Design a protein around this ligand. Structure first.
Ligand SMILES: O=S(=O)(O)OC[C@H]1O[C@@](COS(=O)(=O)O)(O[C@H]2O[C@H](COS(=O)(=O)O)[C@@H](OS(=O)(=O)O)[C@H](OS(=O)(=O)O)[C@H]2OS(=O)(=O)O)[C@@H](OS(=O)(=O)O)[C@@H]1OS(=O)(=O)O
Ligand SMILES: O=S(=O)(O)OC[C@H]1O[C@@](COS(=O)(=O)O)(O[C@H]2O[C@H](COS(=O)(=O)O)[C@@H](OS(=O)(=O)O)[C@H](OS(=O)(=O)O)[C@H]2OS(=O)(=O)O)[C@@H](OS(=O)(=O)O)[C@@H]1OS(=O)(=O)O
Ligand SMILES: O=S(=O)(O)OC[C@H]1O[C@@](COS(=O)(=O)O)(O[C@H]2O[C@H](COS(=O)(=O)O)[C@@H](OS(=O)(=O)O)[C@H](OS(=O)(=O)O)[C@H]2OS(=O)(=O)O)[C@@H](OS(=O)(=O)O)[C@@H]1OS(=O)(=O)O
Lengths: 195, 203
């Protein structure tokens, strides 16, 4: 138990993979739980054709009540799973951006900087920022797809988030602009990457 | 263009896969549109840092209105995709069930009734029923997490629906009564089948 939780998922299993699998295991488990309740309810239905109405009514409430508890257990479980996954995705995106940023700095702070090395570290950094950009747009696109009202409310926040990302890229590039020659040299190579 | 639509998706592609791929193409398409509007909106703020309030305000309302419209298009388009997919799934499930029932009946009516085939046919039929059953559960199960209020309103319907299926199955198993003998040899094997929690393809 506690020990298995500590080790957690094996390294051979990615977050995405483990996430789908946990989602599948949870769904499969709740599908069975619900089915059992439904069959008990059906069995009670057959058995009670002749009890008085008040008792028939109580039986119905009993099962509708058990199902409510189950539906609420289901919702919480899902919400948590979805919540955890979203957090790990954001963390991975931030971690990759920071890693790439450090790599870009190193290449820049090299006794004799190397055009190829700097350019590739910059591509890496730009890609991490783009992945944050895609992620921001996809989340918004999705809420718009399933919840119009909710999408209208995050609209301005998304717009601002994309701006925050752009400013980070301009500021990070500016660092390359601290080396005129290097800047000019990578100019056409840089532009292609941005566009 | 009309011709390609007549043909529709290749038979090789399942309804589930086509649906998924379609959802993904729409996701990418819409993400690109939204990105263009956001870029135009950012660019506008920039060229408006030295203008009158009213004008700057009207800019906000302009781009936010374009997005309202875009959000509405995305939501409607998604509802249409989901409706089409659901209607086809329900059709697909009824079709495979009816096909498996005919196959089970044809193996029971076979001049020299062969157990291997009768049993296998029964399995395909149970698998078709299992499929409708799981779909009912899985759906009710997802609604329960999305809109609890709506899940509460489905309870009875699901309960009734699952009973319909179980009763259908018992009725269909009643076809093995015309041949009380065959039922014997198969008695055990059928018992295990109906007692499973889930039937995959087999071995
Ligand atoms: O760092 S990675 O380039 O490996 O990307 C991992 C994260 O990418 C997502 C989507 O992020 S997004 O770009 O912001 O939209 O999923 C992407 O990768 C997974 C597979 O990851 S895996 O770890 O190497 O197993 C793909 O799933 S799958 O198709 O391989 O089954 C996604 O394809 S798709 O989402 O099904 O279309 C792929 O998306 S994408 O092609 O990059 O657009 C994140 O998952 S997500 O946020 O739930 O969509 C991944 O974050 S994660 O923590 O690794 O799960
Ligand atoms: O061509 S099919 O009619 O078989 O459709 C294939 C897709 O069916 C799903 C989902 O259902 S759907 O939305 O109606 O398409 O899975 C379901 O069907 C497959 C095949 O079952 S079957 O009727 O014998 O053909 C089952 O897989 S398996 O049991 O053969 O291993 C699924 O059972 S299970 O979920 O794997 O336990 C069955 O799910 S369900 O309970 O019937 O809803 C798609 O897979 S799914 O999206 O993971 O559910 C199939 O897509 S696929 O391209 O065929 O893989
Ligand atoms: O009306 S529902 O409550 O069922 O909502 C339907 C939407 O649910 C998503 C996920 O929404 S999310 O939680 O906001 O991310 O899809 C999920 O459910 C549908 C159908 O659910 S059900 O009860 O089985 O019928 C599944 O479609 S289907 O495969 O069953 O045909 C989704 O699987 S699939 O990838 O679409 O094939 C299932 O996704 S998941 O397994 O939960 O990850 C929405 O899809 S979404 O674009 O991923 O958000 C559904 O469509 S919706 O029109 O946006 O509501």
């Amino acid at each position: 138990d506690g020990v298995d939780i500590y080790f957690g998922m094996p390294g051979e299993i990615s977050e995405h993979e483990g996430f789908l699998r946990a989602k599948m295991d949870l769904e499969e488990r709740r599908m069975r739980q619900i089915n059992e309740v439904m069959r008990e309810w059906a069995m009670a239905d057959n058995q009670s054709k002749n009890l008085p109405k008040a008792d028939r009514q109580a039986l119905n409430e009993h099962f509708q009540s058990i199902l409510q508890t189950l539906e609420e257990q289901v919702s919480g479980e899902r919400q948590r799973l979805v919540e955890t996954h979203a957090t790990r995705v954001i963390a991975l995106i931030n971690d990759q951006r920071r890693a790439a940023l450090e790599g870009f700095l190193a290449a820049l702070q090299a006794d004799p900087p190397q055009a190829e090395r700097v350019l590739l570290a910059l591509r890496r950094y730009l890609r991490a920022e783009q992945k944050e950009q895609r992620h921001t747009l996809r989340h918004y696109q999705h809420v718009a797809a399933v919840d119009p009202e909710k999408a209208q409310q995050m609209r301005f926040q998304v717009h601002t988030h994309l701006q925050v990302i752009e400013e980070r890229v301009n500021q990070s590039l500016g660092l390359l602009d601290q080396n005129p020659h290097l800047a000019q040299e990578l100019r056409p190579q840089i532009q292609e990457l941005l566009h």
